[PDB]
Short mmCIF file of all heavy atoms in Angstrom, two decimals:
data_model
loop_
_atom_site.label_atom_id
_atom_site.label_comp_id
_atom_site.label_asym_id
_atom_site.label_seq_id
_atom_site.Cartn_x
_atom_site.Cartn_y
_atom_site.Cartn_z
N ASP A 6 -1.71 21.97 -1.61
CA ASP A 6 -1.49 22.93 -2.69
C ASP A 6 -0.12 23.59 -2.64
O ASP A 6 0.54 23.78 -3.67
CB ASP A 6 -2.59 24.00 -2.66
CG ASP A 6 -3.97 23.45 -3.00
OD1 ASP A 6 -4.16 22.98 -4.14
OD2 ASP A 6 -4.89 23.50 -2.16
N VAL A 8 2.76 22.45 -1.20
CA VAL A 8 3.83 21.53 -1.61
C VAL A 8 3.67 21.15 -3.07
O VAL A 8 4.64 21.04 -3.82
CB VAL A 8 3.83 20.28 -0.72
CG1 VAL A 8 4.79 19.25 -1.26
CG2 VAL A 8 4.17 20.68 0.71
N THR A 14 7.40 23.46 -9.78
CA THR A 14 8.23 24.63 -9.94
C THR A 14 9.70 24.38 -9.64
O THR A 14 10.53 24.33 -10.55
CB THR A 14 7.73 25.76 -9.01
OG1 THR A 14 6.38 26.07 -9.35
CG2 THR A 14 8.58 27.00 -9.23
N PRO A 19 10.27 21.34 -0.29
CA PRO A 19 10.71 22.45 0.54
C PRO A 19 11.69 21.95 1.61
O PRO A 19 11.73 20.74 1.86
CB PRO A 19 9.45 22.94 1.24
CG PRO A 19 8.30 22.28 0.56
CD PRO A 19 8.83 21.11 -0.21
N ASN A 21 11.63 22.05 4.82
CA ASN A 21 11.18 21.49 6.09
C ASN A 21 10.95 19.99 6.04
O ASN A 21 10.31 19.43 6.93
CB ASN A 21 9.88 22.19 6.50
CG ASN A 21 8.88 22.19 5.36
OD1 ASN A 21 9.17 22.76 4.31
ND2 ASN A 21 7.72 21.57 5.56
N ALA A 30 18.07 8.66 12.24
CA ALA A 30 19.42 8.95 12.71
C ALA A 30 19.38 10.07 13.74
O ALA A 30 20.14 10.10 14.70
CB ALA A 30 20.32 9.31 11.53
N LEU A 31 18.46 11.02 13.54
CA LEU A 31 18.32 12.09 14.51
C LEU A 31 17.62 11.63 15.78
O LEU A 31 17.55 12.39 16.74
CB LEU A 31 17.55 13.27 13.91
CG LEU A 31 18.29 14.11 12.88
CD1 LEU A 31 17.30 14.97 12.10
CD2 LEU A 31 19.36 14.97 13.54
N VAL A 43 12.54 15.69 18.15
CA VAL A 43 13.92 15.43 17.76
C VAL A 43 14.32 16.17 16.49
O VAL A 43 15.50 16.33 16.20
CB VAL A 43 14.14 13.91 17.56
CG1 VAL A 43 13.71 13.16 18.81
CG2 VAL A 43 13.39 13.42 16.34
N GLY A 63 2.03 3.88 -14.19
CA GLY A 63 3.41 3.58 -14.50
C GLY A 63 3.74 4.01 -15.93
O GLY A 63 2.85 4.30 -16.71
N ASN A 75 0.25 18.10 6.04
CA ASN A 75 -0.47 18.59 7.21
C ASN A 75 0.13 18.14 8.53
O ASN A 75 -0.57 18.15 9.55
CB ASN A 75 -1.92 18.12 7.18
CG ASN A 75 -2.76 18.71 6.07
OD1 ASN A 75 -2.52 19.83 5.62
ND2 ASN A 75 -3.75 17.92 5.65
N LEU A 87 1.87 12.30 -3.51
CA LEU A 87 2.64 11.36 -4.31
C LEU A 87 3.10 12.08 -5.58
O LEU A 87 2.25 12.59 -6.30
CB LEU A 87 1.84 10.13 -4.72
CG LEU A 87 1.80 8.95 -3.75
CD1 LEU A 87 3.18 8.34 -3.60
CD2 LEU A 87 1.20 9.39 -2.42
#
Side-chain angles (χ1 to χ4, degrees):
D6 293 297
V8 172
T14 300
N21 50 299
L31 287 164
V43 306
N75 293 330
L87 273 295

